Amino acid sequence: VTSSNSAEGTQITDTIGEPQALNSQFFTIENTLPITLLRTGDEFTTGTYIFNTDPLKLTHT
Amino acid sequence: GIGVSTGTYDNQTTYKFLGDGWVEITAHASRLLHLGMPPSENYCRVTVHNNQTTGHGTKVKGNMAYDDTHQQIWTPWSLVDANAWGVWFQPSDWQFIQNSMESLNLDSLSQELFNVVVKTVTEQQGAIKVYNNDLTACMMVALDSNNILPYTPAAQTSETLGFYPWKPTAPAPYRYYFFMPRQLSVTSSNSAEGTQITDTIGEPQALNSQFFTIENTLPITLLRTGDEFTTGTYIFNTDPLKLTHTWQTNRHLGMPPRITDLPTSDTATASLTANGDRFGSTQTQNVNYVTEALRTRPAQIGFMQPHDNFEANRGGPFKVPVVPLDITAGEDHDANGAIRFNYGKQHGEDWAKQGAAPERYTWDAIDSAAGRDTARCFVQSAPISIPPNQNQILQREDAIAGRTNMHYTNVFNSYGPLSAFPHPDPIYPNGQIWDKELDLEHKPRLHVTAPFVCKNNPPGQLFVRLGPNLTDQFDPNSTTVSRIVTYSTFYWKGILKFKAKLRPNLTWNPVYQATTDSVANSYMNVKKWLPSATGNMHSDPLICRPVPHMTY
Amino acid sequence: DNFEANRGGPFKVPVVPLDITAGEDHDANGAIRFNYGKQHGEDWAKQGAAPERYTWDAIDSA
Amino acid sequence: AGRDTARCFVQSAPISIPPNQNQILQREDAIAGRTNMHYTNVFNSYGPLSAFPHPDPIYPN
Amino acid sequence: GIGVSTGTYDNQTTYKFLGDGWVEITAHASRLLHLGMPPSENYCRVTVHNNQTTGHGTKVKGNMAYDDTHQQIWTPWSLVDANAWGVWFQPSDWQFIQNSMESLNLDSLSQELFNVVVKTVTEQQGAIKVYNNDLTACMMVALDSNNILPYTPAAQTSETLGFYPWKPTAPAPYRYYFFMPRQLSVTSSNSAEGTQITDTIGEPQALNSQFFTIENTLPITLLRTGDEFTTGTYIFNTDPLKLTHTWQTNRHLGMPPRITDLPTSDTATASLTANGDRFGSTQTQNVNYVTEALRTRPAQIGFMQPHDNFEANRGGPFKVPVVPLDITAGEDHDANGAIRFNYGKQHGEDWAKQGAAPERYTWDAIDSAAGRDTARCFVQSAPISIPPNQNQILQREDAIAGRTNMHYTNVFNSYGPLSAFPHPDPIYPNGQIWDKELDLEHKPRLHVTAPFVCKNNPPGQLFVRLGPNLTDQFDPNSTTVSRIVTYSTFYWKGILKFKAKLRPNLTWNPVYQATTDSVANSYMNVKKWLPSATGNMHSDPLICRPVPHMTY
Amino acid sequence: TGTYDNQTTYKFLGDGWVEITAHASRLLHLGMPPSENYCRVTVHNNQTTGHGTKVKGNMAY
Amino acid sequence: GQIWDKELDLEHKPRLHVTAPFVCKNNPPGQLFVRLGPNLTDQFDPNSTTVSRIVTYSTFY
Ligand SMILES: [Cl-]
Ligand SMILES: [Cl-]
Ligand SMILES: [Cl-]
């Protein structure tokens, strides 16, 4: 953290590190999901999903 | 039933897989206990007042933090407490669970006392001691099923049973807090010498006095050598504990901005489109542009906590607890509630180490996404202008109320409706496992000292003590007490069951695992978990929640 | 306008979108400003790289 | 569950004991150069770890 | 069936736990393949003879090891081979299996080809190429169920399918060895210049000639764009593979000698009773005493192997394979069969690396108890005397037949009825998985190139090729061939199932696990399994059998 | 292989309850990816001029 | 405005989200991914980093 008023000699530390073992997560679509191939005569459906959420008031207080 | 055992020793951990990744971890634990007669035969209302005017006293200026004054009810009873990870699993077990499972939950608890032996000591000449069996003598046992008596987690003061099966242990003596008024005024070393420090302790109050006795509240079982005692099975009702840690911070939530083009070489960077022309949303409408730092995120992961905040009630001053989060790059320990504890040889300290001083360790939250780097934090005046001149930005350096070291971050509370954070990590082996909830209408969202809080009523405390072994001469109307020197030993078996689930595996890259190595002086060197040439053991805190997990 | 920092970097802490009052204290009550393209509202006629911008002020007044 | 504002205080960290006047904020100290405005006046300690009883019923009003 | 897909892409690995620690690992693998027309339309009997008198030729003195001469039948067909660990699991999977399981076995194999597309290429002007669909064109497929044709494991020459799902691959061209006499004489650089090196290759022999054609031996399916082809499920019959390594060597087998007293301090040693008075047994009856080194053990763990032994048959000289065991402290690589292999970018090499040179890696057996430290080995004359004078002990230094570098260990064979050793480790991801057994009355106890050898008949090889796409002008009686430039692409899905069992956990100390780290330049640095700024991947061989296990 | 439909239909079940069914349809365009593989890209605006992070007081950028 | 949102996978969750009115109590609707299949040319080498593909694009409803 610095400000325009802040002394000129002051050096700004701006660093970025190497990928960490504890937090690295590399996913690929190919390896995690089943994939459907669609040629011109094909089509694809998700089927119906049911929401479970709370109502939203349409009035203000 | 003199010459026949009344129980079985068993300290093995068995895993039963029911399929679908579900596992039934049954931890058997057994220890040989030693119980000596109480120094006093009755209940005492003891007071501790360290109001010395020198050293670590409370009378010396600026020594509030050193306060130890309080009143307690000392009882002739002892408590058998096994509420600590170290009692149930051997290192490897903990490792295996942490590396392969992703969820863990308490299922049931059972315990029993058996093979009781009572002995008396008499003198001889040279003088040597002789030990005899008092077959008819007995040991008293009581179980508080409804938790009527004050809850006292022994793990908090390293007084649970020993973490080594082949080594004997002893129960901790039972004692509990009693109300006593306590006032202590605030001062600093700089503070004027003439200034007088008020250090007072009052008389027992009618509105808050509670004196309980085991004898008057619980049914007591007498155990002679041929007897044994069981608690029966207790069923836990607690929430599951995640065995993974989170890493996504507010900066990693959602759709990353779209890069303009792919890097040109393996060493190059890529650039986004101009701040002024980028799409997105912010909550600062004084500037016409979006940036990863200004961009609106769903909620706030982690939050600023007041440190090192001390508050005061009738009882006295005390350090307000804080949620254990990541200590960040900056390593702001106290600001993110890192926990430091000191323990004995029975609970980890190297047996070889000598001196009164205990072993100490500082636990840093595994999670890397909810901590706070106080140094890099700051608040900007609005309407917001960028860049800000020194008068429109409050940062670390700036001092509060003209105090060089007191910065805004010290009294800043960021907690709010949008705050989200992980659960404190379980700590093997010194950590407490479960905890009784506070009997208050409005309860806390969690406890710092334990991962599992009983929604209903927690398992009851197990109390023991030797029966007064009187001598030939006894007078009731006399305060004088004569008793035959007696002590006893007995075994304790406990059965703790967990329900755990094996982890999924979807990342392409290998994941971080808890391992051991041969590199000298490494924290994870195999040599630390092996015996020495003369059998000295050493059990250091083990890592946990090694595997990372998506937060959003 | 509170900024906090983690391993990742500095970031503006979000705030609950409430009424901006008579005083019109925008940032203090989390008004939301967003910039969007022609596909999502911007006038198709408008020209230039700059997107259209709008500031949403919570309907609630209490 | 009450609070004795007078005896309350905050200590700078890393924490040192005893603290010199510059590493401890207490009642006396004034905020924004105002004699009677102390930190306790604008301090909010509420948090995930806060627990307290329910207000008492008041007979007969 | 023109505009409709005929299959599903799926490359996910699913774990199904049946309980009791049993797991059903189902590995789905899918790749997009590219097939071009064959350079030649027919079968060729090609010969390779590197008999140059300079460089790496066989005519230069002492260059036997460089021999590459042989004859082969080159076929216009291509082989789809997925027999390699890298095809089925992503790094993390392998890690998870190695860290948590203790046993692994092959269960079933299934494959299918689908979504076939055939295209023709024609020219244009500026000249640019244009691509069109040949809807009516077809691709030929054949499956050798009974393994009539020569078995050719593509893993041996890094020619299996690519280890990256999102990247395209291609089948390897089919070819097989044909008998041809081959003689090459032994020489050394020191060997006299006038000496003439005999380097001969003979004419095809009647007794050993076998020319097979796909057309004449297998039924062939024609696949047009709307067709698809399935192998149906094959069931493996192989033995389980241990996922642990052994450490006990002959020196750690049985009852350790009884120490006289426990060490006096944590730094002290303990001593046994005098050699002359100690109880026990030895197989050297010239000395009246027992010692850990002389003491009789149950059997011999590991054994001495002849290296670098070259033998010769009609075909030519060849390096005799050796059982992959531990390379010891001494690091005697060739003496313990360490395996070194070179592979392409499709199979691991860093995509970023440039130059014709492939990436190379040397695999050292995980097991630490069966290797041999040639340096420290030795043979003592009997009757045995201790200590032995230089004339009654043969050691490393001593030279055989007056050759400075040829020591007895080079031609010593220790194999015998008492030899016991572990199975070669599986090698992810370059390693072959299963292998066909040799059709000889007396078979080998194992194979070096693969962990699973099919007791019965192995899964059949899958062959493919483009159908000759003729032009308007064609003459049969002419050797001239004109064909329309054609190529095709199609998908391949495979399903490999394993039966594996979760490991037990009984040691007190934490056990060695395969982990990842952040330390720069570490072999196990996370950065190796992540993509680069431009997407360059790198998949190095991963450790396996990390957990130790009792041998006796 | 499908039907285009972008109409919003209201179905009143009575008692004031309504079932709003929103149909939405669009024609999409998909071009091939610039790169065939997965990339670990980094963005670092650490310039010492303009809207860089190296200039004093530019954290927000 | 966004309509629904996935809840944060943390033991202690936020009372709401700023970016959306409906937060899925359970699991939210899954994301729909698409991409063109590599359309290779006559010349292709796996051991090469070089990629040649036929220019392709698609449209669908
Ligand atoms: Cl109980
Ligand atoms: Cl097959
Ligand atoms: Cl959906």
Ligand code: NA
């Ligand atoms: Na600190």
Ligand code: NA
């Ligand atoms: Na504003």
Ligand code: NA
């Ligand atoms: Na070697």
